[PDB]
Amino acid sequence: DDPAARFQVQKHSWDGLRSIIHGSRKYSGLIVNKAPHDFQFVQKTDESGPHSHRLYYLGMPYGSRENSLLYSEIPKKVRKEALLLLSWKQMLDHFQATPHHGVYSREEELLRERKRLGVFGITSYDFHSESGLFLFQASNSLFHCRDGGKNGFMVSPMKPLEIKTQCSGPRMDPKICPADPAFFSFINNSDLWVANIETGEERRLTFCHQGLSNVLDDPKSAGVATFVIQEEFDRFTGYWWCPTASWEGSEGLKTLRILYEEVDESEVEVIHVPSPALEERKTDSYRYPRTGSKNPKIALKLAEFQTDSQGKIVSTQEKELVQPFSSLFPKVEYIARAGWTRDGKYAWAMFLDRPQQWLQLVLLPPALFIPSTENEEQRLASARAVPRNVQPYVVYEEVTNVWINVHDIFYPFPQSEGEDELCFLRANECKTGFCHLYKVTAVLKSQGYDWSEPFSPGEDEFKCPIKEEIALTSGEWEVLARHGSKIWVNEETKLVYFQGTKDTPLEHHLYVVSYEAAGEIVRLTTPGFSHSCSMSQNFDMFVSHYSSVSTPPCVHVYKLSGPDDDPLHKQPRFWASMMEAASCPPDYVPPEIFHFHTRSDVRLYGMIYKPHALQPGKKHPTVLFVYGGPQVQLVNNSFKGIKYLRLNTLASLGYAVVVIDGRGSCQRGLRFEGALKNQMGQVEIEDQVEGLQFVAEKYGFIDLSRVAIHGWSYGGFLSLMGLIHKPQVFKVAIAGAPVTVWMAYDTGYTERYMDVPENNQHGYEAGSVALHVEKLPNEPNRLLILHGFLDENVHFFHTNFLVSQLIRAGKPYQLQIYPNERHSIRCPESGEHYEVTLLHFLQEYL
Amino acid sequence: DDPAARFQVQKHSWDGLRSIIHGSRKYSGLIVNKAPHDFQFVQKTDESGPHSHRLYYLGMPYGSRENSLLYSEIPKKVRKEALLLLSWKQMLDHFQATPHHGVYSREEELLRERKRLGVFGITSYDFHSESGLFLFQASNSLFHCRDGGKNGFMVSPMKPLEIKTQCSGPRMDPKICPADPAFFSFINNSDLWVANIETGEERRLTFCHQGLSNVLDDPKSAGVATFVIQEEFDRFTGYWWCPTASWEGSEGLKTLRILYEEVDESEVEVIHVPSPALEERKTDSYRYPRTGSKNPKIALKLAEFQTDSQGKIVSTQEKELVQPFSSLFPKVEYIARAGWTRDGKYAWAMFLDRPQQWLQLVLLPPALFIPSTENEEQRLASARAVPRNVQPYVVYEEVTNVWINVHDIFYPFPQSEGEDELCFLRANECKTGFCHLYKVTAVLKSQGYDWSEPFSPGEDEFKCPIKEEIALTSGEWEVLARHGSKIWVNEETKLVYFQGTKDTPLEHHLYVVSYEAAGEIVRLTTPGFSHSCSMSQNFDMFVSHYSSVSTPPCVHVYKLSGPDDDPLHKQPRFWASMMEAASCPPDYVPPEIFHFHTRSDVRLYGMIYKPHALQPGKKHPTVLFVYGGPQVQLVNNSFKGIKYLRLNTLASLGYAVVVIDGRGSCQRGLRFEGALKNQMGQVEIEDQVEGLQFVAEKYGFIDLSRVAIHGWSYGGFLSLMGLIHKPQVFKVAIAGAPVTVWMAYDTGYTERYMDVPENNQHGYEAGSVALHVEKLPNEPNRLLILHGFLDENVHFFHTNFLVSQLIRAGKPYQLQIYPNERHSIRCPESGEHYEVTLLHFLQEYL
Amino acid sequence: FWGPTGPVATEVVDKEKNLYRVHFPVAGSYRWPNTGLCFVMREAVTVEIEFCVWDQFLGEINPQHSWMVAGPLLDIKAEPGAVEAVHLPHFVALQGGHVDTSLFQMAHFKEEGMLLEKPARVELHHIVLENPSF
Amino acid sequence: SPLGVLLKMIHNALRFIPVTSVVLLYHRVHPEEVTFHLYLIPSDCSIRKAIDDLEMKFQFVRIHKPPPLTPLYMGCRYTVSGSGSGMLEILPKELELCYRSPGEDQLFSEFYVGHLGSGIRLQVKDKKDETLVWEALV
Ligand SMILES: *[B]([O])([O])[C]1[C][C][C]N1C(=O)[C]([N])[C]([C])[C]
Ligand SMILES: *[B]([O])([O])[C]1[C][C][C]N1C(=O)[C]([N])[C]([C])[C]
Q1: Are B515 and B489 in contact (CB under 8 A)?
Q2: B229, B714, B786: which to mutate for ligand 2, most atoms within 8 A of CB?
Q3: What is chain C's Cα-based Rg?
Q4: Distance of residue A828 Cα from the nearest chain B Cα, in angstroms
Q5: CB atoms near residue A93 (< 10 Å)
Q6: Most exposed residue of A507, B221, B457, C25, measured as fewest CB within 10 angstroms of its CB?
C-alpha cells in the first residue's frame, strides 16, 4: 500500500466546485433537447402533393424552453446522398402553455411526479386520427386543434382553441371519444366528466365525490388511478372509452360507454406530507397504503350516456356488475390494466392478487353491467333482465412462484370468424422466465349463470379453456412490455412489431415476427445502438429515437420498403432524420461497458467511467454508483450523459466510477430478477462488491481503501447496505432518499418483492437498514444522508427514522435536505448544490 | 501569527468523545437533583409535640426515578453547632406516578413543553390548607389526600385516593374550590368540568367544544390558555375559582363562581407539525397565530353553579358580560392574567393591546355578567335587571413606548373600610424603567351605565382616578415579577416580602419592606449567592433554594426571628437544611464572572470558563455560547453545572467558553431590554463581539482566528447573525433551533419586540437570517444547523427555509436533526449525541 | 461580376432585404471581391441572388450548435440547368490541421427541410459544386 | 430553395476549427468625443453589411486596417488590450469570436478613446497560450 501511488483528488474550494458543476452544464443545455416523442403518423392521400406523411410529436424548438406540439413533413421521395433532417414546424402560435415559474396544480404536480415528467409544458396529448383532433392540457386548462380531418393541412401555425369550463378545479386526463370525435372526457375533482367540443356542453357522469374536506372524509374517487397503481403498476388513468358506439334503437340515440374504476380508499391509512408552499406550514393528506395495510377497494363500472344527432347528452347512466366486484372476483387486489376490444364487444381487464403472483385477463361484456339504484328490487329486476348466456370470460391466467410483472401487451383480434374463440397477443414472462409474445386462442363457451341470486366463484370458475398458445418468440431475451413499451400489430400483413433484447440485453431493438407462422424474427434497427421506436398506423415507416454509450440520442425516420408479397423482409431504409447527435460535452469521456461472471456463474454487466487523464500506476478512489433494484437497468448501450453527467464530472476530477447491474435488475428475465425475492438488500450489495473486485483486478486504478457507494431511491438503501455489511469495502456512503424501513413502504412495490410483513418478517427486518444502525460505523465522515423533504414516494419518515435510530445507537451522520424537492432533484439550483455537496464530501472524506 | 503558540485541541475519535460526554454526566445523579420546590408550610398546634410545622413539597430522592410528594418536620427548636439535615419522607405509597419510558398524553406533553418540565411524575400539585386536601395528577388519573383537617397528621405514608371519571380523555388543570373543599374543577377536552370528592359526581360547565374532528373544525375552547398565552404570556390556566361563596337565599343553595376565558380560535391559522409517533406518519394541527395574522378572539365569562348542603350540583349556569367583550374592551388582544380579589367582590384581569405597549387592570363584578341565552329578549331583560351603578373599574393603566412585560404581581387588599376605593400592590416597570412595587389607591366611583343599549368606550372610559401611587422600591434594579416570582404580603405586620436584584443583577435576594411607610429595604438572604425563596403563610419562616457560580445548589430553611414590635427588622436565622450543596467535582471548574463597559458606556456582565490546565502564552479556540434574547439571563451568580455542563466539558477539552449578557436581556430594566427593539439581531451580536474582544484583552488565551458562536433558540438565530455580519470574527457557527424568519414566529413574542411585518418591514427583513443567506460563508465547515423535528415552538420550517435559501444561494451547510425532540433535547441519548456532534464539529472545523 | 467585361456593378433593388441581380454577358466569371463568391456559366442570362439569413431556418433545426456557419447562405434564382459551377466562400482551415475534406457537407435548404448534400471539392477558400445548383 | 455553406465539426472531438475572421473598428468625427467599436466577427459580407447598415444608422464609419496574418480559433476567449488600455476605458476584459446571425446586433468591445490621436496601438490576445494573432496601428 504505497501512499505515493494512490491518486489524490485536487481539493477544490466550494466556489471552485460550483464553478466545475456549472462548467459541466454550460454545454448540457444543447445535449438534451427533450427530443421528439409521442409520434402520430398521418397520411395526406393526395397522389400529387409533395409530402407523403405528416409526423406529429412533442418537442422543444430553440426559441422556447418548453415542450410543445409540433409536426414534420415526410416527403414522397428524398434525394440520394443527401441527409435530410426535418424542420420542426409549430402547430401552435408560440403561446405560453406553462404557469408562472413552472408551478402547477397539486394533481398536475403529483401526476408529473408519477410520470417522472421533468420537462414543462405540453407533456401528454391525445389525438384522434380521422377527424385529426389534438386534445391537450396547456396551462391549467384544456385546449384542442385539428389538422386535416374534414379541414386541411396548415403551413403557418394556428392558435389552439380553448375549451372553457363551468367546473371549479383542474381538468385531468383528457381523452377523445373514438366513436364520436365531437365528444371527449376528463377527470374533474376525482369524478369522470364528459364534454363536447362543438357545443361546449359538459356533463358529470359519476357522483361518488363531493369536495367536502381532505381525503380523510370524502374517500370515493372515480376514473382516477390511485398512488400505488400510479407509482407501482404504471397506470395514470382509470377510465377507458369504448371505441365504438352502440345504438339503442329507442328513437335515434347513440350510446357511448366508458369503463371506469371506482375506488373506495376509506380503509386506507392517511399520511401527512409537507406541501410545496413551505410558508403555509400545512401538509397534504395522502392515502398511502402501507405493506400489510389495506389497499383501496376497487370495482369496475360502466358510465353510459346517449346522444341526439345534434350531439347533446340527453340521458346518462351509471352501471355496475350484477354482483359486487369483490364477490364476482375475489382475491383481486389490483386492476393493473383495462380497456376494450376494438369492435366494442368486451371490456378487458388485467386483475392481480395481493401477493402479485396471480394475474388474469377477464372480458366484461357491457350487458353484464346492469344499472345501479339504491332500491334492491329494481336491482333484482335488471338482474332478471341480464341474459343468462352473458358472463365474464377469464381468457388468460398467469400464475407464478416469483412475481407478476405487469405487461400491458394484450392485443385481442377481431372475432367475426366464428363469433366465439377470442384470439389475442399476450406477453407472458411467467411461462419460460422471459417476457415473450404469444398468440393465444381461448374458447368462450358460456356456462349459464342465474345472475339474480348470489353465487360464489370457484378457483377455476370463469376460466376458459385454451384452444392454443403458440409462442411467437422464445429465448434468453425479452420483449419490452413495461415502461410504456408496446407492440404494433399490422393485421393486413399479419405481422407484429415489438421491441426487445434479442441481440443483447444492453440494446433495445425493433423486431418483427408473424403471428400466423411464428417464423424468424427480423430486426429492423441498426445494431450497435439502442432504440426507442414507434410505428406508423399504416406500417410503412417508423421513427426510432436511438443512442449508444458513445453517441447521444438522435431521432431517425426509417421506411419499411420492399415487395408487398413478403412483408416480413421489407428492408428499413433510412428516409429522414428528426434530431441529430448533439456534439458531446467538453471533457466527456464515455463509459466502458464490460461484463463478468459471478461465483455462481451468472453474467452481470457493468459500466466504468475512467479517471480523466489517467496515469497508470496510480490507484484512484472509486465511486460505486448504484441503483440495483428492479425495474431499472443502468448499464446498457445508450447515452448516459443526460441523467449521469455527474458520473462523468466525478471521472473528470479523477474518480473511478463503477456501475453494476446486480441480480434483480430489469430485462434479464424473471429468474434473474427473482434472485432478490424475500431477501432484498442481501444479494445486490454482494453483486456490487464482486463487480468492484472484478474491476479492481481487471483495471489497475482502483484503491479499495477508498470506495464510496452512492445512489438514490433504492441506491441510498443499498449504499446503507454497503456501509453495514461491507464497511471494510466501502469507505463512505452517500445515501440519497433511502428506503430505511420496508414496513413503511407501499404494497404494490414491496409485496411483489418482499411479501406481506406478517409472512416474511425475517427479511423485512434483515433488509430494513434503519433497524441495523448498530452495524454502521462509529467513526464519522463515512455516511452522508440526502433527502428531499417533500418526498411523497420515499417519505422523509425513512430518513427521519434512520436519523432517529442513528441517534439512539450513538452514531454520527452528515445530512442534507432538499426542502423544495420531492424525489428526483428537479430544480437546477438544488441539483447543482447536490452535486457540489457530493464532490465536497468525496474530496474531503473519501 | 506564531506558528505553535495556538492551542490545538486533541482530536478524539467519535467513541472517545462519547466516552467523555458520558463521563461528564456520571455524577448527574447527585448534582442534577431536581432540588425540592413548591413548598407549603402547615401548622400543627399540638402544644405538646416536637415539631412546629410540616413542610409539604415536591422532591426526588432518587430512591425512585420520579418526582413525588414528600414532607419534612420543622421542629420547635434545633441544637446549636449541628448541621441538621432532614430526611425526606414520602407522603405517597411509592407508586410510579409516570408511565412507561416517560411517555405522556396529548396535551399534557405540550403543557410540560410550555412549562419546561424536564422531570417526571408529579410536577405540579394543588393544595387546600384548611382541609389539607392535596390534589395532583399522576400518570393517567387524578388523586387526592388529606393531612390533619378533621382527620390527623400522618406518620407512615398513606396511599392516594383515586378520583374516578365518566369522562373520556385526560383531566387537565385540577384546582380545588377554596370556598368548598368538597368541590374541585378540571379541564376535560377543552371544556371546564367540576366535581365533588366525597360523592364522586361530576358535571360539565361549558359547552363550546364538541369533539367532532381535529381542531380545524371545532374551534372554541374554555378554561384553557392557548399556545401564545402559554408560550408568551406564561399562563397555563384560563379558569379561576372564586375564593368565597355567595348565598342566593332561595332555600339554602351555596353559589360558587368561576371566571373563565372563552377563546374563539377559528380565524387563526392552522399549521401542521409532525406527531411524536413517527411511524404513524400523521401530523397535529396547531392553532398557531403567525406574526401579522389574527390571534384568538377572547372573552371572559362566569361559570356558576349552586349546591345543596349535602353537596350536589343542583343548578348550573354559563354567564356572559352585558355587552360583548370585544365591544366593552376594544383594543384588548390578550388577557395576560386574571383572578379574583380575596373577599370575592371583583374578578380582576390584565388586558393588553396588539403592540403590547398598553396594559390595564380591570375589575369585573359578577353582576356585570348576565346569564346567556339565544333569546335577545331574555338578554335585554337581564340587561335591564343589572344595577345601573355597577360597571367595570379600570384601576391601573400601564402605557409604554418600549413594551409591556407581563408582571403577575397585583395584590389587592380588603375593602371593608370605606368600600368606595381599592388599595392594591402592583409591579410597574414602565414608570422608571425598572420593575418596582407600588401601593396604589384608586377610586371606584360609578358613572352610571345604561347596560341595555350599547356604546363604545373612549380611551379613558372606565379608567378610575388614582388616589395615590406610593413607590415602595426605587433604584437601578428591579423587583422579580416574571418567571413565576411573587410577593408575600403579611397584612398583620403590613410587610411585603419580595425578591429582587437590589444588591446586584447577578443575585436574586429576598427583600422586605413595609407598604405603609416605605422606609428601608431589608435584605433577608445571605449575599454572595442567588436565592429562590418561598414564605410560610404565617410569615414566620421561609425556604431558600440558593446557589452561587462556584458552589452547587443548596436548599436551606431560614426563620424570621426577633422582637415582635418591629417586624421589618426580624432577623433571619438558619434553622435547618433540607438539601445541601453537593460535591462540586474536580472535573468541574466553575466559571468566572466579569463585567465590562461598552463604547456607549453600558455595563454588560459575562462569564468565562477557562481552558482546563491552562498554559499561559497559548491562544486557545473559543466557543462563545449565547442566547442574547429577552426574558433570559445566562450570566448571574448561580450554579451553572446543571444546565450548562457541556460548557464545562468544552472547557475541560481546552475551549475557552465565553457567555455574555448583551443588551436586550432580562432583569436589567426596560431601557436595557429595549435596546434591541424593532431591530433584533443588530445590537446583540455587536455586544457579543465587543465582549469577546474585551475578554481577549482581559484574558490572554483567546485565539480570535478560531471563534465559534453557538446557541439554541434565539442563540441559534444570533449564531447565524454572527456568521452573517461578523464572519471575520466567528470562524464557525453552531446554530441550534434557530428563528430564521421572524415573519413566521408567533404574535406574542415577535410583536412585543418587533411591531408587525406591515409597520416594521425594514427590521423584519434586516433581522431575518434566511433573507441574508448570500452573506453567509461560501466556504464549508463553518455552519452547522441543528433542529428538533417536532419543534412546536420554533418550527422546523425555520431550518427548512434556511436550508432552502442556502441551496438557492449556493452555500454549504451541515445539518443535524432530532426527530423525537421538540424545542429542547429532552432525551439523554439525544443530548449525548448532540454534545458529541458539537465536540466533533469544533474539534475538526474550528 | 468583375470578369472579362470588367466591373458589372450589381444593381440593388432593396437594401433592406439584401436582394441583388446581375446580367453577365460573357462566358466564365471572376470572384466578386466582397467575400469571393463566384458562379461560372457559358452564356449571357439574367440571374438574381438573395443573401438569406440562417436565423429563421436554423431555428427550425435544433442542434444548430452542431453545425458551424461557414458563409453567407446565398439563394439563386436563375433558370435551372444553365448554371454550371457555384463557389461559396469557405472559411480557411486547410492551412491548419485536423479538418477533413471527405467530411464536408453542404446545406441545401428546401421547404422540406435541410438537405446535406456532399460538396464536390473544396478549394482554399471555396467549395465547388456541379451543374444542379438550384 | 436556399443554398449555402456550413461546416459540421466532428461529433467526438471539439476541434475549435479556425476561421478567416476579421475584426473591425468604427470612428466618430462629428460628436464631442470619439468611441471605437471593435467587432470581433466572422469575415462574411452579410455580417459586414449588417454591421454596415447598423453603423450607418448610428453614424459610425469604418477605416480599412490590416487584418490578422493567420487563422484564429473560433470560440476561444480573447482578451482585448492596447497602449491606451487602463487610461482609456475598454468595456470588456474578454471578447468572443463565435458566430451570430446578421439579424441581431453582433457582440462587440466598446472603447471610448477621447482624442482621435495620430496613431494608437491595439491588441487582442489568446487566453489559451498568450500568442499574438493581431495588431493594427490605428
Ligand atoms: B425508489 O426506488 O424510487 C422507490 C423505493 C422502492 C421502489 N420505489 C419507487 O419509487 C417505485 N414504487 C418503483 C416503481 C421504482
Ligand atoms: B427560543 O428563544 O426559546 C424561542 C424563539 C424566540 C422566543 N422563544 C421561545 O421559546 C419563547 N416564546 C420565549 C418566551 C423565550
Answers
A1: yes
A2: B714
A3: 15
A4: 10
A5: 11
A6: C25
